[PDB]
Curated annotation (Swiss-Prot), chains A, B:
Note: The diphthine intermediate is not stable in vitro and readily eliminates the trimethylamino group. It is not known whether the elimination reaction also occurs physiologically.
Reaction(s) catalysed (UniProt annotation): 2-[(3S)-amino-3-carboxypropyl]-L-histidyl-[translation elongation factor 2] + 3 S-adenosyl-L-methionine = diphthine-[translation elongation factor 2] + 3 S-adenosyl-L-homocysteine + 3 H(+)
NCBIfam families found in the cross-reference section: dph5
Annotated keywords: Methyltransferase, S-adenosyl-L-methionine, Transferase
Gene3D superfamilies reported for this sequence: Cobalt-precorrin-4 Transmethylase, Domain 1, Methyltransferase, Cobalt-precorrin-4 Transmethylase, Domain 2
Gene from which this protein is expressed: dphB
Protein name: Diphthine synthase
Swiss-Prot/TrEMBL GO biological process terms: methylation; protein histidyl modification to diphthamide
Top-rank taxon: Archaea
Role of this protein: S-adenosyl-L-methionine-dependent methyltransferase that catalyzes the trimethylation of the amino group of the modified target histidine residue in translation elongation factor 2 (EF-2), to form an intermediate called diphthine. The three successive methylation reactions represent the second step of diphthamide biosynthesis.
HAMAP family: Diphthine_synth
Oligomer status and interactors: Homodimer.
Organism: Pyrococcus horikoshii (strain ATCC 700860 / DSM 12428 / JCM 9974 / NBRC 100139 / OT-3)
Pathway membership: Protein modification; peptidyl-diphthamide biosynthesis
Length: 265, 265
């Protein structure tokens, strides 16, 4: 009669909360999805070993089209868990699944976990200064989406930071790198000429948040565009004007050039 | 030779990540602060029991004025942890403590935990649509803070949602309720008269996120301003223009008036 939405956290199998782990262990059935994002620091096998239960992986179609036929029937008569990377319901489509549960007469509860949305706090940028967020999507064929560029423009215009989620082909386990994202933005700039993203733009790269050894780097596009930030996932941030405290953290912790202390504050 | 900043999560001792717990258990010394937020579902005793170590609680003064005298000295020759509610670097000034660690020759690492900043996803509002955030502070003396009102105005004009952290006076055991926040906002409205926050404004209240049964309510200020949302902590949200799916969730899960289903495109 109960369905638990449980977040797995940021990077590896230990990023699930103690609460999430203990609940998952007591569930009769455990499902999971790895299409909204991936857990780059672990494997399905290691997650299963930790929970001590077999985990049935569900595809985007399994969930979006058949959640009520695959998960809910069992949840109607058993304790069922649905694991998701990060924090449950951060992904836009997940919230609606709680309505499906209600419709099916199944109670649902949410067990939170760390999300990259809040983990960016490790960049030293004040969380309250982050504005609207966006996703940089790989262009393909004759389709060249650029709305994320406008998001940066609108946030920066108001002195706000912009969190940019990078494209991920979960199924093929292919991650867009911060370098590729920078190249794309420069490409968009060359087309819109809005003066939003150039070689002189200050950016922050956060790779493998959740790991004990994440890569946190800050600097100008011209210098970071070909830098190796390590293994994915990568997150790109275009900060707005900086509070001196933010700038000093970027210099001391993220290796930012001293120049930001006078140019970006 | 190391200092770990470890988040404890939203509501109780089990909201810590497994990673955080396993590291905390092996630390030589464990410190913590409980003034940045309120964990309404646990006690110091229960936290100490789970970690299996004595925890020295620090006051805001101990941290802000003497972190480098109380914590860092021991971190030079031992493995030390500093625990905080939620995520240690979200809506706190703790990021700066990493700079103090560096100058003291102490390596620091961050272990994230669920944060209210991302937990708001449980309200059904799309996380990417949240704009700049703000804090509703208790007026004191002749000083009546109002900057949060302008944040709401700015986000709303862009169609973005506004997350409002609520004030907390840990030493006085005072935790601002959503009701008190709405009352303060109505007063600022009368002063500035910008048509930003009135009795007809739709708001969302999330109380005790992290618990299994948090209070999630949506409705007009005139109807919710005197409603009992249960024990603190509380957070208030002022949505911008809603997507149809957001409205459906607010109606089905947060008990909002079904009239909001009729979005004005
Ligand atoms: N479980 C919870 N439910 C509702 N609001 C919460 C909450 N935890 C924190 N808050 C809100 O956030 C304020 C503290 S701000 C510090 C937040 C913390 N670092 C985090 O990551 O969550 C509180 O006064 C309250 O308004």
């Amino acid at each position: 009669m109960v369905l638990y939405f449980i977040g797995l956290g940021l990077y590896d199998e230990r990023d699930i909360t103690v609460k999430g782990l203990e609940i998952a262990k007591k569930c009769d059935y455990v499902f999971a999805e790895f299409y909204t994002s991936l857990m780059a620091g672990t494997t399905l096998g290691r997650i299963q070993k930790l929970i001590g239960k077999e985990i049935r992986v569900l595809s985007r179609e399994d969930v979006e089209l058949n959640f009520e036929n695959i998960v809910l029937p069992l949840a109607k008569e058993n304790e069922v868990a649905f694991l998701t990377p990060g924090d449950p319901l951060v992904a836009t489509t997940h919230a609606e699944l709680r309505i499906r549960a209600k419709r099916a007469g199944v109670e649902s509860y949410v067990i939170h976990a760390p999300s990259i949305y809040s983990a960016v706090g490790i960049t030293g940028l004040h969380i309250y200064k982050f504005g609207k967020s966006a996703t940089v999507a790989y262009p393909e064929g004759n389709w060249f989406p650029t709305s994320y560029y406008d998001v940066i423009k609108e946030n920066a215009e108001r002195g706000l930071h912009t969190l940019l989620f990078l494209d991920i082909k979960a199924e093929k386990r292919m991650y867009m790198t911060a370098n590729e994202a920078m190249e794309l933005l420069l490409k968009v700039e060359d087309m819109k000429k809005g003066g939003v993203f150039t070689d002189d733009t200050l950016v922050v790269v956060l790779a493998r948040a959740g790991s004990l050894n994440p890569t946190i780097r800050a600097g100008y596009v011209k210098d970071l565009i070909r830098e190796d930030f390590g293994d994915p996932p990568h997150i790109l941030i275009v900060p707005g004007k900086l509070h001196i405290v933010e700038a000093e953290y970027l210099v001391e912790i993220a290796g930012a050039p001293r120049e930001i202390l006078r140019v970006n504050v």
